[PDB]
Design a protein around this ligand. Sequence first.
Ligand SMILES: O=C(O)C(=O)C[C@H](O)[C@H](O)COP(=O)(O)O
Ligand SMILES: O=C(O)C(=O)C[C@H](O)[C@H](O)COP(=O)(O)O
Lengths: 281, 281
Amino acid sequence: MNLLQHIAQSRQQLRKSELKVADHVLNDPASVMHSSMAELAHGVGVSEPTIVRFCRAIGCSGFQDLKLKLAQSLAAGASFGQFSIHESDSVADFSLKIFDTTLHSLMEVREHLDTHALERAIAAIAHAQRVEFYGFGASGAVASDAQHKFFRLLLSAAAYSDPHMQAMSAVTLKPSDVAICISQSGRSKDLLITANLVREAGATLITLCPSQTPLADLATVNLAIDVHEDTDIYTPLTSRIAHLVVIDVLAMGVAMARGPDLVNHLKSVKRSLRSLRLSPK
Amino acid sequence: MNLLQHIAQSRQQLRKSELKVADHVLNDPASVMHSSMAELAHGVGVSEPTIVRFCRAIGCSGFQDLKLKLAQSLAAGASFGQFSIHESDSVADFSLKIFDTTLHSLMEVREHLDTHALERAIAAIAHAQRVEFYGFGASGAVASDAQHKFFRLLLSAAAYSDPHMQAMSAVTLKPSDVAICISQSGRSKDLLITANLVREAGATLITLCPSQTPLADLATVNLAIDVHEDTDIYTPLTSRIAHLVVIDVLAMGVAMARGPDLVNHLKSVKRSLRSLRLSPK
Ligand SMILES: O=C(O)C(=O)C[C@H](O)[C@H](O)COP(=O)(O)O
Ligand SMILES: O=C(O)C(=O)C[C@H](O)[C@H](O)COP(=O)(O)O
């Protein structure tokens, strides 16, 4: 377990004095490592006992343990991704950690699914003429990925990561239609504007985001996907995998809702690639 | 196990007479289901014993078993995705099947990693000034997804799914630089053109695709990602998840190769979002 991630996760447990230590530590770990307890206490503006209580609340044995573990937690890639990367990891180590973390997160998401929320989303999309996917950064990529899966299911599918296009498109939706807003944070300002416009048009807003976020509150159907990845700190990685697997379940659901006609539709779609891909052998 | 998928998978095992049956069955399952053995034999242009041998080679007990199982394998969504969907599945059923299939595939990919191929790809990218991601359809979405992960790692990252842009961009690459071609099939014609241009420019071609494909043969570093998903038939789904997790391992590898400077780089990148996302609480 990477001590900096642990400290970041732990902040809502600390007392105010200890929190001040936590934030000083997160802001500059490498100074702390060459710091006496007195210097650090001076730095943060707290007593030496506060330092030690912080260390113990973090699960270290005391100040020397803090520094030791800090020294093991400063890999550059530990900041890149929420994986327990250690200063000296090899492809051997980080490859398996990344896959294992992904497996563990998807299992957790699978376990926590709101099956009913899924059923309502699938039935909304299945009755829609248009489905749109809205998001930014990582969630924009998910949006366009989802458009590529959904365009073949006998409706109009579109994805936008330009908020001006989202707004203008949204307000043209019939109440009969669906928009999915995708957000690991649930806190993207433009996306809440867009979500409000969807609502105002009377269309179904599906939120693919954690529960009890600003965006979740606006939703018609809150999918409640609670991957624990702190994207104020880490690159979004695990969160978008979970989002895409959820997208795939909605798509499957919509396919389910179509007739035996779909089979031949999908066969035409695949046939159209014949001249663009070499034959197998 | 969905009988139509099983039959499709099984084709390379059959004898020529049985194969003719397989393809007739795949092409129109619903006719077969209301067909006598004699009619089907007439249809395909084979003997009744051939029909029965086909059934047995497919692991059915005989012709009546074939029809029964066919009747259970005709869900519209069974054609949409390579998941063992049955005529009457509920979100309960297909949601868990989709997650389970994904977990099983990622475990298989994790087990089969070519760790050395990973190390060589990571070191190529880590010395490059430019990294480019090329693909189409699902693989285009992966390309743009990867660009969103990589732009923060102190190089120029670009993704193109327009083959004309790929060609023109490729030929401007220094031998020092990297292109990743992404393909579940390994058989996209434009992508082989692009891959050849990368080679011709002396730049490192990483192929994120199955081994022993046309594209794998062109590679400088073949990542050998052998997800078993037949995208001549099914929507690409599981394949692109595996691709993205592999992308994330390469990104982690590159982060690893940077100094402690990266920490503050990545912190600036995250700080720039402050005015665009509400604060937590
Ligand atoms: O690239 C990064 O480091 C990011 O964190 C950018 C985020 O993907 C976007 O700001 C979208 O944020 P969400 O609306 O919470 O999905
Ligand atoms: O949407 C579908 O049904 C497709 O199969 C389209 C494929 O994603 C592209 O043709 C790219 O193919 P690859 O180069 O093998 O990755």
